[PDB]
Amino acid sequence: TVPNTISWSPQVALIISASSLLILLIASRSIKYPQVGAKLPVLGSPSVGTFVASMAFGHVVGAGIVLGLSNLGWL
Amino acid sequence: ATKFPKFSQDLAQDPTTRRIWYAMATAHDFELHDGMTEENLYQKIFASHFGHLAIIFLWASGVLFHVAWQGNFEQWIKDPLNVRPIAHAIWDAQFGPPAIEAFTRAGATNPVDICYSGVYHWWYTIGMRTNNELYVGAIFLLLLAALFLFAGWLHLQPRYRPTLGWFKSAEPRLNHHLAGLFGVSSLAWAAHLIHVAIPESRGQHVGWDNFLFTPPHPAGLGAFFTGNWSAYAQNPDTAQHVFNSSQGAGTAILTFLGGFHPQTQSLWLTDMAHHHVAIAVLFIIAGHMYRTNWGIGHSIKEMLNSKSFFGAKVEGPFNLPHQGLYDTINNSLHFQLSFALAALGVASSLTAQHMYSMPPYAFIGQDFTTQAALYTHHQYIAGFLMVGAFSHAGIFWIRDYDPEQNKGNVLDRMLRHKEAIISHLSWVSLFLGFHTLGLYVHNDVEVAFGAAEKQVLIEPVFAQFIQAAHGKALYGFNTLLSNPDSIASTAWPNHANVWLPGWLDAVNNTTNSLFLTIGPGDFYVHHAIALGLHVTTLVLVKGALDARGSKLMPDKKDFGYAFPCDGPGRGGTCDISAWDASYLAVFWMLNTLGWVTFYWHWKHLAIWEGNIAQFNESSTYLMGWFRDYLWLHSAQLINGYNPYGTNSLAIWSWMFLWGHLAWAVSFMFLITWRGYWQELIETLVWAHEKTPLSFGYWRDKPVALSIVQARLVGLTHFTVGYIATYGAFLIASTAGKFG
Amino acid sequence: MRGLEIGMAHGYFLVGPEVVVGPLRETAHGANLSGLITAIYIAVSACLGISIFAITTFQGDPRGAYGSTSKDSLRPLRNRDEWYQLNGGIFLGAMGGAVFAYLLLENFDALDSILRGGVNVN
Amino acid sequence: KLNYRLDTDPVQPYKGDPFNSNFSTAITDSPLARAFINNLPAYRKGLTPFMRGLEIGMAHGYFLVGPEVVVGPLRETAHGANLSGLITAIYIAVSACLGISIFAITTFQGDPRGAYGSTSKDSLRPLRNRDEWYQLNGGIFLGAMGGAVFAYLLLENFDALDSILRGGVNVN
Amino acid sequence: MNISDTQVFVALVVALLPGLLAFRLATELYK
Amino acid sequence: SHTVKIYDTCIGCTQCVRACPTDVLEMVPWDGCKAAQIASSPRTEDCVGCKRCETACPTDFLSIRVYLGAETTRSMGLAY
Amino acid sequence: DMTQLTGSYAASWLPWIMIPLIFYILPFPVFALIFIWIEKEA
Ligand code: F6C
Ligand code: F6C
Ligand code: CLA
Ligand code: CLA
Ligand code: CLA
Numbered sequence A: 001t002v003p004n005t006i007s008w009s010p011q012v013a014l015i016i017s018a019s020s021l022l023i024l025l026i027a028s029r030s031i032k033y034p035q036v037g038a039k040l041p042v043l044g045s046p047s048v049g050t051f052v053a054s055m056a057f058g059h060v061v062g063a064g065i066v067l068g069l070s071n072l073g074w075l
Numbered sequence B: 001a002t003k004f005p006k007f008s009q010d011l012a013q014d015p016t017t018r019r020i021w022y023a024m025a026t027a028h029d030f031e032l033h034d035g036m037t038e039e040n041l042y043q044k045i046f047a048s049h050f051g052h053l054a055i056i057f058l059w060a061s062g063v064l065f066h067v068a069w070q071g072n073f074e075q076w077i078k079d080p081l082n083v084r085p086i087a088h089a090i091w092d093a094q095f096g097p098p099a100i101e102a103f104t105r106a107g108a109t110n111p112v113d114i115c116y117s118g119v120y121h122w123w124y125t126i127g128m129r130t131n132n133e134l135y136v137g138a139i140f141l142l143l144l145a146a147l148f149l150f151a152g153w154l155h156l157q158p159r160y161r162p163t164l165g166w167f168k169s170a171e172p173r174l175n176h177h178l179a180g181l182f183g184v185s186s187l188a189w190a191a192h193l194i195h196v197a198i199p200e201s202r203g204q205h206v207g208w209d210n211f212l213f214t215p216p217h218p219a220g221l222g223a224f225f226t227g228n229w230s231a232y233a234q235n236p237d238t239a240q241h242v243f244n245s246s247q248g249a250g251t252a253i254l255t256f257l258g259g260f261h262p263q264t265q266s267l268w269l270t271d272m273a274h275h276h277v278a279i280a281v282l283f284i285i286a287g288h289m290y291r292t293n294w295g296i297g298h299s300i301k302e303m304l305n306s307k308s309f310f311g312a313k314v315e316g317p318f319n320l321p322h323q324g325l326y327d328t329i330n331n332s333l334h335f336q337l338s339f340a341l342a343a344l345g346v347a348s349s350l351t352a353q354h355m356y357s358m359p360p361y362a363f364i365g366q367d368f369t370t371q372a373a374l375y376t377h378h379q380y381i382a383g384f385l386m387v388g389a390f391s392h393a394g395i396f397w398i399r400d401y402d403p404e405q406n407k408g409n410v411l412d413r414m415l416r417h418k419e420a421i422i423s424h425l426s427w428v429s430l431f432l433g434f435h436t437l438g439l440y441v442h443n444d445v446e447v448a449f450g451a452a453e454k455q456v457l458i459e460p461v462f463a464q465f466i467q468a469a470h471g472k473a474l475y476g477f478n479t480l481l482s483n484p485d486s487i488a489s490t491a492w493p494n495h496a497n498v499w500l501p502g503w504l505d506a507v508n509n510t511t512n513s514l515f516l517t518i519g520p521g522d523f524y525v526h527h528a529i530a531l532g533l534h535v536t537t538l539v540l541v542k543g544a545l546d547a548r549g550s551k552l553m554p555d556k557k558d559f560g561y562a563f564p565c566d567g568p569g570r571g572g573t574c575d576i577s578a579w580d581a582s583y584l585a586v587f588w589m590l591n592t593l594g595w596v597t598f599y600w601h602w603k604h605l606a607i608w609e610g611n612i613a614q615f616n617e618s619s620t621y622l623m624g625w626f627r628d629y630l631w632l633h634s635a636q637l638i639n640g641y642n643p644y645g646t647n648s649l650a651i652w653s654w655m656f657l658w659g660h661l662a663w664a665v666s667f668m669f670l671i672t673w674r675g676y677w678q679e680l681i682e683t684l685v686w687a688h689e690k691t692p693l694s695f696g697y698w699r700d701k702p703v704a705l706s707i708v709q710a711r712l713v714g715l716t717h718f719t720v721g722y723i724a725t726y727g728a729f730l731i732a733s734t735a736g737k738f739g
Numbered sequence C: 001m002r003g004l005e006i007g008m009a010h011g012y013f014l015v016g017p018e019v020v021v022g023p024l025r026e027t028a029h030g031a032n033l034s035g036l037i038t039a040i041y042i043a044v045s046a047c048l049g050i051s052i053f054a055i056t057t058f059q060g061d062p063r064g065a066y067g068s069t070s071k072d073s074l075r076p077l078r079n080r081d082e083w084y085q086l087n088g089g090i091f092l093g094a095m096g097g098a099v100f101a102y103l104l105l106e107n108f109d110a111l112d113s114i115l116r117g118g119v120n121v122n
Numbered sequence D: 001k002l003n004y005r006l007d008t009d010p011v012q013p014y015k016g017d018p019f020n021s022n023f024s025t026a027i028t029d030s031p032l033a034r035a036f037i038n039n040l041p042a043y044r045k046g047l048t049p050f051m052r053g054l055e056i057g058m059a060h061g062y063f064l065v066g067p068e069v070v071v072g073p074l075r076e077t078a079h080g081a082n083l084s085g086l087i088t089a090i091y092i093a094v095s096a097c098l099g100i101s102i103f104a105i106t107t108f109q110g111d112p113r114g115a116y117g118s119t120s121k122d123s124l125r126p127l128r129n130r131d132e133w134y135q136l137n138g139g140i141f142l143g144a145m146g147g148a149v150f151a152y153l154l155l156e157n158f159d160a161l162d163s164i165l166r167g168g169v170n171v172n
Numbered sequence E: 001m002n003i004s005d006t007q008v009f010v011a012l013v014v015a016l017l018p019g020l021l022a023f024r025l026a027t028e029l030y031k
Numbered sequence F: 001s002h003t004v005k006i007y008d009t010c011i012g013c014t015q016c017v018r019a020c021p022t023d024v025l026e027m028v029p030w031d032g033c034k035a036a037q038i039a040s041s042p043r044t045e046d047c048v049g050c051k052r053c054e055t056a057c058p059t060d061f062l063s064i065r066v067y068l069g070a071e072t073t074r075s076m077g078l079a080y
Numbered sequence G: 001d002m003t004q005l006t007g008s009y010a011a012s013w014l015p016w017i018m019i020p021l022i023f024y025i026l027p028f029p030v031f032a033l034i035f036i037w038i039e040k041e042a
């Protein structure tokens, strides 16, 4: 059977936003070279490259989580 | 000198056979090893614990593999009440055809042993259904044992050897073992019960291939996060539910029905799941009590050393000085081992007492031999654990206790009124023994003279009152749970007594082991059990408290835990060490557990016969025990092989003798002492030296076994004979007489 | 040579007991095989014992009767190499004697005809 | 600036000599590998050369019978297959012992060439005397013949041994 | 239906790893 | 070998030396007691551990103590 | 038949070989190894 994919709803927006936000906190405190290049609070004051990388990885991880849950009926 | 033992130069220079023997007896006493430091001691203990865990996992893997390979698990599933579970196959190339025919049974085409450990019922209850699942579990346990062996090796490497401070950090260890080792493990087991065991008991297959997308409950996890927890208790299994099928099956995952499942006569799986959920929550909460790294939390040393009760001056908790104890336990591995062994013994006793009355496994209550074997096994293990707890308490007294760091605290006070403690224990033991034995022999004489009515038959009214308070209406008492109008039965403020219907149904059922009816014989045997417990405690406590010294030997602490004697001077000092007290107490532990298991087995044999009156009328005099329990039930056991042929009991028949042999052998080690054998060995040495063609010659000079070694060997033979004889009798009298 | 003679004698007589009163005594061939196997097993165990005795006894100055200063006339093999030569002789002689007894017992009918002149009929 | 880091090297030079064409590895220098190899009959301390050859011969003669019994050209019949396996072991062992004899004849003339010279320090080749090689050969031949016959006798008696190991001899 | 020949052989092969690791741990503890 | 120790409560009664079956003890000059002598154990290598000296000692508690230790050929009392 | 030891389980020859090996073939070599270990001079 074709794995289930759910229609767009505020819950998938929450999953993607939370994944991007949590990655933003972790990356600015864990990656080897943050604050490299141009600069953009509670964060570690990440650079432009760090922030864009966090958002891109938030989309990558968030998409995997959204399809992963929707496949299994929310795991 | 020899290289072996590596850990003792004193033994390595010994030119006699003793060097070998002691090398085995002191190998695991790491503290006495040459050049031993505390940090190395802790690291070696940690690695040894890894090894022991690996051994346990390998044992479980072997049990699973042999059941999956040679057992009849799948056939037993289809009819647990009439199929004999198979432990493993028999390969004894010196059997005759009659033995092969006798041991070929339980639907097998080859000789097999009948499993009595109850693992079939346990695996059936937790959702295992196929031999492939058992094989996968065995492979996984092999891998887990390999992982733990690798961890043990790794934590001995220089970079991974933990420091002494890591081993001495009590608070984080307590937090992690309460919240994670106890709480998280219980939560994971509840998860396994909810996700796997209950659906399998309802005829639905859940495994690693489909558990990710098969919700255990229709309401899903949304009911838990919203707070609609009651949805998990809705629609429980009906009273007509058939195990391992959807007929009469409910959908609830966490109920509190109580009592027993009507068909399996065992505890509800949903009840067990909710139990483990609650236990996990409680232990996770408890695992946050102590301060580790964030300021919050109690400090055990501060609590023990505290002397102020909200401003008022107190000597300590309950106005008792507990100061200095934190360092006493923290620096004494024997003290911690004493608590560990005592707790494990109490837990094993509780397991034995609660598993027969409240069977947790489907149909395990109808496997009489399995029930008897499990009860006896766990009770004997509990007795051994208690003996070990007190032995290591004595070892702590000798090795780890120093008076100045414990001046004034409760331990010092106990050491200071040890005389009163021991004398009062002796008084209790004397009273119990005198009156119990006197009443027994009075009843024996009266029954022998045809006057059974003249027996003194004291009713156990207190225990009967407790049973009535628990809901047993047989005795006519109308108190608490046996009174439907009682404040306890109604629970007037809330009426949340959702256990009471099922619990009362189980209590008042006449075909189970939940609060068995008791009479004068139960009273007398319970007082005999109390006598045994008090005498064993007296021996162990007298050994522990006198370990440091007595009037006969004021300087005992300077001679160690285990030494033979202090010579024939001052009247003679045989068996004066605390080790000798533990040696003596093992005999009383064996006697007490023998009484306990005799009582349990005879009562349950009478129940299973349909001849409860035999136990009721015969247990009040000792000739009844001798005749109607031992002599009456030994017939099938001793007829396992005879001049007319053999049957499946032959092994037990042989082992029954084997134990009787080992027991007899122990007497030789316990009655005859060393010097006789030393002189005989000297004569044999002369004989060998003067005989031609005997080119052999000893490299270690043959000597008689030492005094302590002889006591230990005799005790080992005695215990092995005791256990083998009683186990053979138990299995033969229950299995050859029932299913 | 000492080991060879001792082995021949011992392996020769060790075959008999299982041949006569063993559990395969109901049939001749099985009984003879069981006797030969028992002799082989006993001799191999004894030779392993001799080997480990030589290994453990002769380290440095041997303890007891095999030391340099010992004067035990009943134990004359004072060197490890003598013990190994003796063990080799013992093993070979024991195997040979066991096989000789096994061959004699396997051919019991032929040997009985031999010792009664029954082979002279034709 | 130059850090060979030999002190932390898991693989060390063999026996402390970096120029002996060898390494200290798990195969060559681990405690288990050294214990196993040095206690084989070829290297066991104190063994006489004849006793070395005996143990080696018994082991090799025993297993050399097997291959022709199972996949040989006489495998169709039990008795024929066992005879062919015994003969094959005898032929191989006798040929090997002939090679050992002529090795001793040619190697030990004057000061032997190569690893068997007086100044050689080959620890893997300790039999430095001609008489040791002949004692070894006598043990090899007698051991191989005995081991081959032992395997032959067990295979000849496979039916009896199968009943033996299954308890079938206890019927009567 | 009990396990097959292949499963028994696989279990025997797998059990080699805990055996070797146990030997390693025993030799390390003997140190 | 066993260890034989003599404490300052010795009264120099010479009984332990007389009781020893292997001549481990001897009397040496001393000033701590009226007898002006004290027991000594210069030859503890010959001590078998019989504890006859402890039996013979009249002081309370014992002025001479024997602690069994590593066993040798002569401490086990072996004639072979 | 019930006149001999047999096995309906997979690889029934395995007990046939392992019982002798563990119980009366290997134990004597193991005892010899232990004896060598415990008698070695320092
Ligand atoms: C080593 C070597 C040696 C030798 C040689 O060389 C010997 C010899 C003798 C003579 C002289 C005499 C006679 C003989 C008979 O009859 O008896 C025996 C039997 C048998 C069988 C013994 C045995 C023999 C050998 C040991 C054999 C071996 C072989 C095997 C098989 C091995 C195996 C190995 C494996 C590894 C296991 C004797 C005797 C006596 N023993 Mg005496 N030994 C010895 C050893 C030993 C040990 C270990 C011990 C401990 C247990 C003892 C003990 C004893 C006693 C109790 C007595 C008595 O009584 C006797 C008498 O004195 O009289 C009089 N002893 N020696
Ligand atoms: C238990 C127990 C017991 C038993 C069981 O029951 C027995 C048995 C038995 C039986 C199987 C027989 C028989 C078989 C008939 O009858 O038939 C055949 C014959 C023939 C074939 C014969 C023919 C003729 C021949 C060949 C001759 C001989 C030769 C020689 C050896 C040489 C000599 C050299 C110099 C001069 C010495 C016998 C004989 C015996 N023996 Mg008996 N064992 C016993 C013991 C013993 C002891 C201790 C001693 C000592 C040491 C002994 C010695 C001996 C000798 C020498 C002998 C021989 O001549 C043999 C024969 O091997 O053979 C082949 N046992 N083995
Ligand atoms: C977790 C449990 C546990 C642990 C870690 C220990 C640990 C220790 N105990 Mg202890 N003990 C325990 C439980 C435990 N015990 C119990 C339950 C009892 C009551 C029976 C005792 C009774 C006891 C005594 C009386 C003594 C110790 C001693 C010791 C210390 C040295 C061990 C020794 O003598 O060398 C290793 C010892 C052995 C290997 C003993 C040989 C085996 C015995 C004879 C059993 C016979 C074997 C039997 C036939 C089959 C068993 C199974 C088989 C596989 C072996 C060591 C710290 C000794 C000590 O500290 O000396 C001052 C000491 O004197 N213990
Ligand atoms: C059948 C066997 C048996 C019996 C009856 C006893 C009895 C006793 N043991 Mg005991 N014991 C035994 C075997 C036995 N042991 C064995 C095999 C060992 C292992 C070595 C031990 C190890 C042991 C230890 C280590 C301890 C005891 C203790 C006790 C006493 C506590 C129980 C008590 O006071 O009851 C009441 C007394 C009795 C039941 C004894 C019988 C009294 C008789 C029947 C009175 C008859 C009077 C009559 C006029 C006599 C006739 C005249 C006659 C003199 C000719 C008691 C005297 C403990 C103790 O002394 O505590 C105070 C203690 O510390 N025992
Ligand atoms: C501890 C677990 C354990 C136990 C007690 C047994 C017990 C038994 N097995 Mg067994 N077995 C096990 C695990 C176990 N098995 C595992 C995991 C496998 C798969 C590799 C096997 C595979 C197996 C086969 C193929 C056969 C047996 C057989 C037997 C029986 C005769 C003994 C024998 O030949 O051993 C043979 C054992 C092996 C081939 C491997 C055993 C591997 C285990 C894990 C080693 C355990 C070591 C132990 C934990 C360390 C002890 C420490 C010491 C202080 C006590 C006996 C009932 C025979 C049988 O059925 O006879 C009728 C037989 O032919 N077993």
Ligand SMILES: CC1=C(/C=C/C(C)=C/C=C/C(C)=C/C=C/C=C(C)/C=C/C=C(C)/C=C/C2=C(C)CCCC2(C)C)C(C)(C)CCC1
Residues within 6 Å of the ligand: C008, C009, C010, C012, C013, C092, C093, C095, C096, C097, C099, C100, C103
């Ligand atoms: C003292 C005396 C006596 C005794 C004696 C005896 C005891 C004897 C024995 C004897 C014996 C017991 C003998 C035996 C012998 C043997 C032999 C003679 C053998 C031989 C062998 C052989 C010849 C072999 C060969 C072989 C080999 C080597 C290899 C290949 C195969 C074969 C087989 C060929 C009497 C009493 C009479 C009298 C008095 C005195």
Ligand SMILES: CC1=C(/C=C/C(C)=C/C=C/C(C)=C/C=C/C=C(C)/C=C/C=C(C)/C=C/C2=C(C)CCCC2(C)C)C(C)(C)CCC1
Residues within 6 Å of the ligand: C040, C044, C091, C092, C095, C096, C098, C099, D058, D059, D060, D062, D063, D142, D143, D145, D146, D147, D149, D150, D153
């Ligand atoms: C390394 C190792 C291994 C391997 C092993 C092997 C490779 C083995 C082999 C083995 C073998 C391969 C063995 C064999 C043996 C043999 C024998 C034991 C023999 C004997 C013999 C005899 C006894 C003989 C006799 C005789 C003679 C001498 C003459 C006359 C005739 C007769 C026959 C009698 C394994 C993988 C497992 C594991 C890991 C480690």
Ligand SMILES: CC1=C(C/C=C(\C)CCC[C@H](C)CCC[C@H](C)CCCC(C)C)C(=O)c2ccccc2C1=O
Residues within 6 Å of the ligand: B668, B669, B670, B672, B673, B674, B675, B677, B678, B703, B704, B705, B706, B707, B710
């Ligand atoms: C019989 C006996 C002997 C003689 C027994 C001796 C010398 C021991 C003999 C043992 C033989 C040589 C081997 C027995 C081996 C066991 C069957 C199993 C041992 C298991 C371990 C090796 C693992 C004493 O020395 C003795 C000393 C003090 C009090 C009582 C006695 C006593 O009763």
Ligand SMILES: [Ca+2]
Residues within 6 Å of the ligand: C119, C120, C121, C122
């Ligand atoms: Ca003719």
Ligand SMILES: [Ca+2]
Residues within 6 Å of the ligand: C023, C024, C025, C026, D169, D170, D171, D172
């Ligand atoms: Ca027979």
